[PDB]
Ligand binder design. Structure first.
Ligand SMILES: *[C@@H]1O[C@H](CO)[C@@H](O[C@@H]2O[C@H](CO)[C@@H](O[C@@H]3O[C@H](CO[C@H]4O[C@H](CO)[C@@H](O)[C@H](O)[C@@H]4O)[C@@H](O)[C@H](O[C@H]4O[C@H](CO)[C@@H](O)[C@H](O)[C@@H]4O)[C@@H]3O)[C@H](O)[C@H]2NC(C)=O)[C@H](O)[C@H]1NC(C)=O
Ligand SMILES: *[C@@H]1O[C@H](CO)[C@@H](O[C@@H]2O[C@H](CO)[C@@H](O[C@@H]3O[C@H](CO[C@H]4O[C@H](CO)[C@@H](O)[C@H](O)[C@@H]4O)[C@@H](O)[C@H](O[C@H]4O[C@H](CO)[C@@H](O)[C@H](O)[C@@H]4O)[C@@H]3O)[C@H](O)[C@H]2NC(C)=O)[C@H](O)[C@H]1NC(C)=O
Ligand SMILES: *[C@@H]1O[C@H](CO[C@@H]2O[C@@H](C)[C@@H](O)[C@@H](O)[C@@H]2O)[C@@H](O[C@@H]2O[C@H](CO)[C@@H](O)[C@H](O)[C@H]2NC(C)=O)[C@H](O)[C@H]1NC(C)=O
Ligand SMILES: *[C@@H]1O[C@H](CO[C@@H]2O[C@@H](C)[C@@H](O)[C@@H](O)[C@@H]2O)[C@@H](O[C@@H]2O[C@H](CO)[C@@H](O)[C@H](O)[C@H]2NC(C)=O)[C@H](O)[C@H]1NC(C)=O
Ligand SMILES: *[C@@H]1O[C@H](CO)[C@@H](O[C@@H]2O[C@H](CO)[C@@H](O)[C@H](O)[C@H]2NC(C)=O)[C@H](O)[C@H]1NC(C)=O
Ligand SMILES: *[C@@H]1O[C@H](CO)[C@@H](O)[C@H](O)[C@H]1NC(C)=O
Ligand SMILES: *[C@@H]1O[C@H](CO)[C@H](O)[C@H](O)C1(F)F
Ligand SMILES: *[C@@H]1O[C@H](CO)[C@H](O)[C@H](O)C1(F)F
Ligand SMILES: OC[C@H]1O[C@@H](O)[C@H](O)[C@@H](O)[C@@H]1O
Lengths: 390, 392
């Protein structure tokens, strides 16, 4: 989407995976979907170095709305859970130097069953702009036709543009189209800043694997379309929660960087391990994800339960990820000719190789003739940066 | 098995999950199956508090054998990877105050393809005893005859007995019987100190779940056969490795305690986090596993992606484990009347409840009519100890 936004993949925090549709503020006041929750996260995004690391967008997902539209037929935030309204919340978020994301749905209802935007795209877009919203996630539930789907995503895209406010536009368009009809990505990109291709992530290694496998299986279709202003969205970062081992968290961070994926954390910033925090704030890894060239990486090799992925970067550099998919035994040895990496240019005549994950270590100079050798932990990833020596 | 051994579930370390059949000592010297690996593991068992915690048995799994038997028809340790032989390794292990486990197979080959013990049950038993072996794990590969399986397992049991040496006998008998007919556990219990019921564990939450679900699905068949001298074996502890989140590791430790499981760590004692070590050496949790009553626990309740398991303990005490099986969102509250716990006996007229996992916390006195309220992390377990009391 040519709106001057998402020139690098959007980075922020989104409530859905960790906090879901918790409306029980009586029994669970500290984790229900409320104005307070977003205030608390805003404060920590500043005080705990998240904004400094590039996480800029504080995003509301589903279950923020009142059950009905107001008298003027506009969306409204829940009167008890969001007693000050969205506009006021955006004022607060802005005063912290952050940006506010919100959520709506192309169909008749949101996925959790709250008011949909079908029939209201222009007023809903204007309402969002009026509130000072900076990002819209636009889900695809309760849409009865393939035609209504396309038209709705296009309509809303154009409606947000006419507001005059810069609003990042996140689309679930391809995901809800897929079962019926294969997406036209040139079309989607024309209308959307990023787009969800695959099923909702959850707090599990199974989930990470299936998303990786979905992406690599479909990489002929989706890799080349991605670029500044339009990204594939493999869903939220779930690092800092409950279901991933340390090595699996490293894999998600490493591969979301390879995939030039938007980085929306879904976690509890009030309760996060030092290790998870340092990985999520990893400067060198964020820098790969945020590479200004914006060329999405891809799976290069698969065999013997290893995967090799690579991504071209600015200034003749490359990122390389090596995953161990064998879920038994110990760290396994993997070797590859450096001449096989970066299409044969990364290390011609030579390259300097720095390992970034699981830990930062300079590996040294590698000749065109060289072989790269690593031990990779089960379900873990080794992430390397290669700098050509001119 | 009435040999006076495994009166509580056996505790130790077994190489298989973490090291498998790595024969490449040239290119993978640190993880290949060698005598140096076992020597070094023995040293760390002592120096790092593992033996103190109760982990006594250093166990060799598959892939220690030379390709062929010697001129006397006896098994031999691989000469390149075990140049000093098993006898000298057993000596080294005993001199650290530990015991040595070894591995063989009922069939013509071990699962990895090395010499089987069929036709050699008595000499192999004697060989191990001469070598100073204290435990035998006996696998079921390359034996496609139900009769030979049963006969070989029974024979090896009696063969070990006749050596006069105390040897823990670990059987994969019920697992390799599954494809043919349901196992007779009275028969197995008579011949074995513990027995593997289900497929090999690996380093994954998926594998933990499948083992738990297999156990609870089959509980009416396996729970009551367990007791001092004979345990169900749900396979190795894989805490300290790579594939389990902290909460998932807590789940395994807790539930292996509920199940009165043998505790065989399969990990690298040279490279293990302080958190995984603290969990594996948790004295209160180990005490539940090692409870003298030796009554296996069971799944009490299941629904809404929750599981409640409990185990009766010595002196009218109970362990209760609450599992959250929902793999999305955050901690979920679960409430239960304490009257429903411990067959209504644990907290009559009252009980003192101490949380053991994920952290140790005293929860206080609970009257028989009162309710217990917890929050459980996705894929995590809350482990509680209930002490029957007349007070408050
Ligand atoms: C509603 O929709 C319209 C149309 O899609 C959007 O308009 C686009 O807005 C973006 C960002 O403002 C424009 O991109 C910028 O254009 C500047 C000049 O462009 C000229 O040259 C191009 C050649 O391709 C012509 O198409 C165009 O007509 C102009 O003659 C550039 O100077 C900008 O450069 C930026 O990037 C460079 C390098 O990366 C940096 O040095 C600078 O910092 C700078 O930011 C940039 O390319 C785009 O041209 C507009 N398209 C059209 C067709 O007009 C609206 O933004 C949108 N409105 C809202 C509110 O969403
Ligand atoms: C080869 O196979 C044989 C046959 O199984 C094994 O011999 C058995 O060994 C066990 C364990 O050593 C013996 O069990 C012991 O029995 C003794 C009781 O004998 C009498 O007295 C008691 C009263 O106390 C009566 O109840 C009973 O009916 C008898 O009349 C006890 O002294 C032992 O108890 C102690 O240890 C046990 C743990 O095993 C504790 O629970 C007790 O509290 C106590 O401390 C014990 O129970 C059994 O009798 C033997 N069976 C036979 C048929 O002889 C060999 O051990 C085995 N050889 C090997 C593998 O080395
Ligand atoms: C949103 O819903 C409207 C309203 O009709 C609904 O759908 C019907 C099939 C039935 O379930 C009713 O109870 C609902 O109220 C949809 O508009 C209708 O569309 C159909 C064809 O799709 C058309 O024949 C009718 O003229 C429409 N009805 C009205 C009231 O105008 C609309 O398609 C839905 N939008 C999306 C994106 O799902
Ligand atoms: C272990 O193997 C022996 C040897 O026989 C082998 O297996 C046969 C099926 C055949 O493929 C031969 O070429 C192999 O050498 C088995 O002992 C035999 O048992 C069969 C009964 O099936 C009997 O007819 C033969 O007389 C036996 N042969 C000998 C050498 O005594 C034995 O069954 C195998 N043991 C186990 C536990 O599976
Ligand atoms: C995929 O969608 C794109 C955009 O809607 C289509 O590209 C347009 O094609 C028409 C002619 O058919 C041209 O007039 C435009 O210049 C194109 N626009 C863009 C953005 O390049 C394309 O036709 C579609 N492809 C398929 C296979 O349906
Ligand atoms: C179980 O097997 C043993 C054989 O040792 C036998 O005593 C018993 O009757 C068997 N039980 C059943 C139900 O077959
Ligand atoms: C849409 O459904 C839910 C919201 O109910 C969630 O936002 C998910 O990621 C979705 F697919 F975008
Ligand atoms: C038998 O197979 C392997 C050895 O190759 C391993 O020991 C496993 O746990 C088994 F099932 F006992
Ligand atoms: O489902 C609960 C039941 O499970 C059995 O296996 C156990 O032996 C019983 O004591 C228990 O009441």
């Amino acid at each position: 989407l040519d709106n001057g936004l998402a020139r690098t993949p959007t980075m922020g925090w989104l409530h859905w995976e960790r906090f879901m549709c918790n409306l029980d503020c009586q029994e669970e006041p500290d984790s229900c979907i409320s104005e307070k929750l977003f205030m608390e996260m805003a404060e920590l995004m500043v005080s705990e170095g998240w904004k400094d690391a590039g996480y800029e967008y504080l995003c509301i997902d589903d279950c923020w709305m009142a059950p009905q539209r107001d008298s003027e037929g506009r969306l409204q935030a829940d009167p008890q859970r969001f007693p000050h309204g969205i506009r006021q919340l955006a004022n607060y978020v802005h005063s912290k130097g952050l940006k506010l994301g919100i959520y709506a749905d192309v169909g008749n209802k949101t996925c959790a069953g709250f008011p949909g935007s079908f029939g209201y795209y222009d007023i809903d877009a204007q309402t969002f702009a009026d509130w000072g919203v900076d990002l819209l996630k636009f889900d695809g539930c309760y849409c009865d036709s393939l035609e209504n789907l396309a038209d709705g995503y296009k309509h809303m895209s154009l409606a947000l543009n006419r507001t005059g406010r810069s609003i990042v536009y996140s689309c679930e368009w391809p995901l809800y189209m897929w079962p019926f009809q294969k997406p036209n990505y040139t079309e989607i990109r024309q209308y959307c800043n990023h787009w969800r291709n695959f099923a909702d992530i959850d707090d599990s290694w199974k989930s990470i694997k299936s998303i990786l496998d979905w992406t690599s299986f479909n990489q002929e279709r989706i890799v080349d379309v991605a670029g500044p202003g339009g990204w594939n969205d493999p869903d939220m970062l779930v690092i800092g929660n409950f279901g991933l081992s340390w090595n699996q968290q490293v894999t998600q961070m490493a591969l979301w960087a390879i995939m030039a994926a938007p980085l929306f954390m879904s976690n509890d910033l009030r309760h996060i391990s030092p290790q998870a925090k340092a990985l999520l704030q990893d400067k060198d890894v964020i820098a790969i994800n945020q590479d200004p060239l914006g060329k999405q990486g891809y799976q290069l090799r698969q065999g013997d339960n290893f995967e090799v992925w690579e991504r071209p970067l600015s200034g003749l550099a490359w990122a390389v990820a090596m995953i161990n998919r064998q879920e038994i035994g110990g760290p396994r040895s993997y070797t590859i000719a450096v001449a096989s990496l970066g299409k044969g240019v990364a290390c011609n005549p030579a390259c300097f190789i720095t390992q970034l994950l699981p830990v930062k270590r300079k590996l040294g100079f590698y000749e065109w003739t060289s072989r790269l050798r690593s031990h990779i932990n089960p379900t873990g990833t080794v992430l390397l940066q290669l700098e050509n020596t001119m």
